[PDB]
Amino acid sequence: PDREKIKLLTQATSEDGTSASFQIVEEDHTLGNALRYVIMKNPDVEFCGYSIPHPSENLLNIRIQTYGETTAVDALQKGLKDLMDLCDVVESKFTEKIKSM
């Protein structure tokens, strides 16, 4: 039950969601860029981008603004699910080509 990993920044959050900034510690461009790509691949997402506010801190601030269909949290959760699925496809294809060789 990790309660420190991902936080919701309330000052950056709208009413009823659909626009929220998340703070993700121990994260950098690696997860930020893949997550942003996958999240932009969602029709309801109108805005996605991350930022590492300072190199000294291992912190990532990812901003999601959606249209009214879904909330930023839902778009985030969908982005994480889709990133997992994509990496699973990559794993299967790569292990198959390794086995074939």
Partner: peptide, 17 residues
């Protein structure tokens, strides 16, 4: 080569400490 070393071995380093 042509070996699925990762399936054969149960990884431990890769999990977060």
């Amino acid at each position: 080569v042509s070996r699925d070393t990762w399936n054969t071995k149960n990884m431990r380093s890769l999990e977060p400490p």
